Amino acid sequence: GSEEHFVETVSLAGSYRDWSYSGQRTELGVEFLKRGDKIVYHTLESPVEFHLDGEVLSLDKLKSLLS
């Protein structure tokens, strides 16, 4: 799955652009990309809804936003 493969790829780097991977499941998804105060989440199930701060993002947006 496209979105799933994004989770997958960042795991292999442990990071993306300037951010850091995580992987701590919580109530609110699993902790994704951390950078400073910004914690992206992703859903366990599909389609993988990426979130940040409270904005559910989309896959193409997310990359652009992680810049």
Tab-separated table of C-alpha atoms in Angstrom:
chain	number	residue	atom	x	y	z
A	1	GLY	CA	0.000	0.000	0.000
A	2	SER	CA	1.322	3.492	-0.941
A	3	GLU	CA	0.803	5.135	2.418
A	4	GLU	CA	2.029	1.992	4.284
A	5	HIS	CA	5.199	2.009	2.128
A	6	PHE	CA	5.862	5.561	3.400
A	7	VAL	CA	5.858	4.264	7.015
A	8	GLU	CA	8.037	1.406	5.757
A	9	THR	CA	10.663	3.629	4.057
A	10	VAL	CA	11.114	6.056	6.942
A	11	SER	CA	11.591	3.069	9.327
A	12	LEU	CA	14.580	1.906	7.258
A	13	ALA	CA	16.222	5.360	7.459
A	14	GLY	CA	14.975	5.875	11.058
A	15	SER	CA	14.270	9.462	9.832
A	16	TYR	CA	12.987	11.662	6.945
A	17	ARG	CA	14.529	15.007	5.701
A	18	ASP	CA	15.303	16.468	9.165
A	19	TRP	CA	12.849	14.430	11.308
A	20	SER	CA	13.357	11.228	13.357
A	21	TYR	CA	11.237	8.022	13.209
A	22	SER	CA	9.582	6.699	16.424
A	23	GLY	CA	7.068	3.748	16.482
A	24	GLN	CA	5.455	4.163	19.912
A	25	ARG	CA	1.798	3.192	19.533
A	26	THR	CA	-0.425	5.319	21.782
A	27	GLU	CA	-4.188	6.002	21.946
A	28	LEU	CA	-3.812	8.440	19.055
A	29	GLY	CA	-2.171	6.187	16.469
A	30	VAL	CA	1.522	5.367	16.386
A	31	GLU	CA	4.194	8.077	16.830
A	32	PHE	CA	5.711	8.675	13.394
A	33	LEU	CA	8.126	11.377	12.472
A	34	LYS	CA	9.272	13.605	15.341
A	35	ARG	CA	11.064	16.929	14.671
A	36	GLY	CA	11.376	19.440	17.530
A	37	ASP	CA	7.817	19.756	18.921
A	38	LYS	CA	6.150	18.294	15.793
A	39	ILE	CA	4.920	14.720	16.194
A	40	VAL	CA	3.385	13.160	13.116
A	41	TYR	CA	1.161	10.159	13.841
A	42	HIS	CA	-0.024	7.449	11.483
A	43	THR	CA	-2.892	4.998	11.819
A	44	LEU	CA	-2.151	1.304	12.206
A	45	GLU	CA	-4.833	0.403	9.611
A	46	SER	CA	-5.500	1.621	6.044
A	47	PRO	CA	-5.717	4.036	4.421
A	48	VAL	CA	-2.937	5.230	6.641
A	49	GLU	CA	-4.153	8.570	7.879
A	50	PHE	CA	-1.071	10.561	8.708
A	51	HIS	CA	-1.748	13.328	11.255
A	52	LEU	CA	0.283	16.208	12.648
A	53	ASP	CA	-0.673	18.321	15.726
A	54	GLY	CA	-4.369	17.631	14.894
A	55	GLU	CA	-4.383	18.031	11.058
A	56	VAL	CA	-5.000	14.756	9.294
A	57	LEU	CA	-2.717	15.077	6.231
A	58	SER	CA	-2.516	13.252	2.890
A	59	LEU	CA	0.493	11.277	1.612
A	60	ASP	CA	1.625	13.742	-1.056
A	61	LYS	CA	1.127	16.707	1.322
A	62	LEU	CA	3.005	14.972	4.159
A	63	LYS	CA	6.286	14.788	2.201
A	64	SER	CA	6.002	18.473	1.274
A	65	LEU	CA	5.183	19.339	4.940
A	66	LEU	CA	8.128	17.285	6.279
A	67	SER	CA	10.405	19.658	4.345
